[PDB]
Amino acid sequence: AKVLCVLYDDPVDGYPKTYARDDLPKIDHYPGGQTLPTPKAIDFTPGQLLGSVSGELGLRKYLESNGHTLVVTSDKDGPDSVFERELVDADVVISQPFWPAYLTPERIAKAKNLKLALTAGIGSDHVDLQSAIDRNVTVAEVTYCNSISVAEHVVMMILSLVRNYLPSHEWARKGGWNIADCVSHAYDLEAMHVGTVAAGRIGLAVLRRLAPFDVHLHYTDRHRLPESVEKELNLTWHATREDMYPVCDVVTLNCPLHPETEHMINDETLKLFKRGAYIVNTARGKLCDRDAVARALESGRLAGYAGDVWFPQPAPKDHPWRTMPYNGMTPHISGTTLTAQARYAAGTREILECFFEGRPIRDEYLIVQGGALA
Amino acid sequence: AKVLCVLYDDPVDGYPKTYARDDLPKIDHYPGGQTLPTPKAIDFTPGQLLGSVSGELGLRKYLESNGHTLVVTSDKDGPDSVFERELVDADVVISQPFWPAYLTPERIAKAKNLKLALTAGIGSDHVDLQSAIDRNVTVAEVTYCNSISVAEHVVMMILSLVRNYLPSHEWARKGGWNIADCVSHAYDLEAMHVGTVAAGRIGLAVLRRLAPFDVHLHYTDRHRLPESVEKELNLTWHATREDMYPVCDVVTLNCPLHPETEHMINDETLKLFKRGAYIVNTARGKLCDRDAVARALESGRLAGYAGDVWFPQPAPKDHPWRTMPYNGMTPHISGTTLTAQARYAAGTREILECFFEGRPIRDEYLIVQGGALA
């Protein structure tokens, strides 16, 4: 069969030959008990760059050994892309959320041998699930592969914003000292109130990690967490998110983007936050009105904003979030650390082997399976 | 009496007229039970910049309304300095560890009226303790005032180094995207081996904060912690520093600088660290041989180094740590956030009121009292 795999570009100076470390930490399961990916074998060394075009998710040898074809490209935007071009007869499509190959209804329609749409990561927002359901395309993802990676990024950014790390580092790097210039916008995180919009795998991991900082934890979600979890973390529930904002010094967004949540942070809802509040958003760029956020930082309503998700993405070279005051942005990378890559590359292989040997794909990985949401 | 108070310079754009937020979070005690400072009154608003020359630790009104003189300066180095000139007849000398007025044997000998040497912060290594003992000078500090502040800075820097945040932020800032350039030196912290050299107020506050990150915790110290604490954090004890190094992914230094620990991190001991380890040092700059650390980063043996302490301080504009690869440095600021400042300006006032009224200074604040170390 034919596997069409869309990956991001290699580094500026080439594909790395040498890495900072020899191995990766051993983990057996994810919080809650889900086990880590269980492929029959892997043809990469954990820690190597796997999500770039030269890493190939460590799949070529396995695929070619069972007489399958592996097409790897980074060109996936438009009708004239390699991806569109190769889609027609690909049996399997693989892409990561970090450089996604959108499976529009149109493409799904022209995708004649398409049986499996695999997300090497988490998050199939780039896929049209109705069309896959109708056309009987199985949609799978490597559940939990990077939830912890994202939660780490969130806590890092909260600390960095509150403590004014980025500006302080600049003074050091540029030959300065200027203690008062660093600390006139620096606070401790201890005892501040922090709230999460949604408490799913990432939101819960974030709350767990913040607890020992002796912050007061708040959350809002579609449904409340089990009472014992609320008790263990001393959580304060908010039935509406607009009720949670005014009492929080820090708000982290960990919810999906829907029409209901598009632009949920705008000039109007920003007026509900306390003066000097901080926002961290590693969820979707468009949860926030780009200009509303920029205005809040320029004016001082907000004391910091950080995340790794933007709109549009890739972000334009002049996107105002790159240079607005008190930002802690990064490009879209939180779930594509070398560590997270080793898990989703292994997960990707495990699913392929299942699909090819006729075995069932773990239920946890399945999104759309055979005419329906599974 | 005459109070000589050495503080750091105001911000380059002047003393702030405005701040990012309106108030500070409420805390009643430090971990273990110690209460926060209890002066009879304060003449500042918590959240203002107090550690710089125009802040004056919020002390002038109190001192001048009681017939005392307050001399505030940042000029403290050498014999022609305002500090050296005024020291001859000062009754009390106050300075912070971030901009320390050194009380060498020679200066103590010249300070004829010296009765109280107060550290507005923690750590009195800028004071010759034997000379103070020999001259009956009381040496006090505001115990616990920024231990949590430092601990938060340590965890922030650990996360930042491991996840390669600083270089990722620069790609964003500069108009790039470059996912693979950001992640080819990016890992998750989860399940790494983290060790602390000493487990004092700061070291233990660091351990507690790292636990939920699901790291494996290690420590070494002069004495072992109680078995209950060891069992609650699942700590692995190492009797020596050299025994601990080789099993750790991240090493944080939270111990004092003595002849014994001076240059404890050097070309030889660095050979014991695993390839790609990280070091965080918010203790003292001289615990590390400056050039051996630079060389380890340059040669790829070490994957990152961060801290806020340097040798010497202020660091010369060409100090190698400013620009060595994979550094996460800041000027010496961890314990001087606006929040920490409010606690040590309040404790400074508490201590002075006790001193001037002949009431005993709290036992936990005393370093040297009545010709002996307390």
Side-chain angles (χ1 to χ4, degrees), chain A residues 167-183:
Chain A
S168 301
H169 179 67
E170 278 301 279
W171 281 109
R173 209 174 68 49
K174 307 247 267 195
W177 198 247
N178 296 85
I179 294 159
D181 304 281
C182 303
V183 306

Side-chain angles (χ1 to χ4, degrees), chain B residues 163-182:
Chain B
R163 302 188 59 77
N164 205 42
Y165 192 20
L166 304 176
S168 300
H169 176 71
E170 294 294 309
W171 284 108
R173 197 179 79 70
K174 285 162 175 149
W177 191 254
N178 298 84
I179 299 175
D181 305 276
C182 293

Side-chain angles (χ1 to χ4, degrees), chain B residues 307-360:
Chain B
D308 70 332
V309 294
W310 319 58
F311 187 76
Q313 291 190 185
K317 179 178 274 187
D318 66 355
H319 186 298
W321 288 8
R322 298 177 176 277
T323 61
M324 60 196 178
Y326 299 116
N327 85 74
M329 301 308 293
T330 63
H332 191 198
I333 70 173
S334 57
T336 200
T337 54
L338 294 170
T339 304
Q341 292 182 39
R343 291 186 297 260
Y344 75 63
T348 293
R349 167 135 186 192
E350 179 192 344
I351 294 177
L352 288 175
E353 289 170 346
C354 286
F355 177 79
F356 286 134
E357 293 174 8
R359 297 185 288 112

Side-chain angles (χ1 to χ4, degrees), chain A residues 99-298:
Chain A
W99 195 257
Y102 281 96
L103 294 175
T104 52
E106 298 87 57
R107 298 173 149 177
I108 294 199
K110 82 207 266 159
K112 297 294 140 70
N113 313 349
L114 200 48
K115 286 178 268 302
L116 178 51
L118 226 188
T119 295
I122 284 174
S124 65
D125 13 278
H126 56 115
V127 183
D128 183 272
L129 304 172
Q130 182 67 72
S131 320
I133 271 159
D134 292 343
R135 305 267 166 161
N136 195 84
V137 189
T138 293
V139 182
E141 75 185 356
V142 193
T143 296
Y144 236 130
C145 63
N146 59 25
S147 310
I148 303 316
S149 319
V150 184
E152 291 183 3
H153 216 79
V154 172
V155 173
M156 174 186 79
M157 285 174 161
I158 286 175
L159 287 167
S160 304
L161 292 177
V162 169
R163 308 188 54 82
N164 208 36
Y165 191 22
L166 302 179
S168 301
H169 179 67
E170 278 301 279
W171 281 109
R173 209 174 68 49
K174 307 247 267 195
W177 198 247
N178 296 85
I179 294 159
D181 304 281
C182 303
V183 306
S184 69
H185 195 92
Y187 301 91
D188 292 349
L189 184 58
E190 194 185 16
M192 275 191 175
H193 281 259
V194 178
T196 186
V197 178
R201 296 173 176 92
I202 291 166
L204 194 49
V206 171
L207 293 170
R208 295 191 171 290
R209 282 155 181 77
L210 285 173
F213 287 82
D214 282 350
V215 290
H216 294 106
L217 297 178
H218 299 248
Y219 81 112
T220 186
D221 213 339
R222 307 303 187 295
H223 299 308
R224 287 192 76 156
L225 286 153
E227 187 182 287
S228 37
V229 172
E230 296 198 336
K231 282 184 190 332
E232 189 195 344
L233 297 168
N234 295 95
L235 299 183
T236 296
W237 161 253
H238 298 260
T240 83
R241 76 201 171 232
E242 291 82 11
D243 194 53
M244 188 180 74
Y245 307 152
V247 300
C248 289
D249 295 291
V250 183
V251 176
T252 174
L253 306 184
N254 294 301
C255 55
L257 175 60
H258 294 145
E260 153 84 316
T261 52
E262 169 173 353
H263 284 17
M264 60 177 210
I265 303 303
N266 62 57
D267 290 292
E268 284 324 288
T269 54
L270 278 172
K271 280 176 196 152
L272 308 174
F273 277 71
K274 336 210 314 200
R275 185 176 92 80
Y278 302 88
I279 296 176
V280 179
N281 172 21
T282 55
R284 285 294 172 293
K286 235 178 186 272
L287 281 175
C288 307
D289 173 328
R290 175 191 80 196
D291 298 307
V293 169
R295 282 184 279 276
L297 291 162
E298 224 186 279

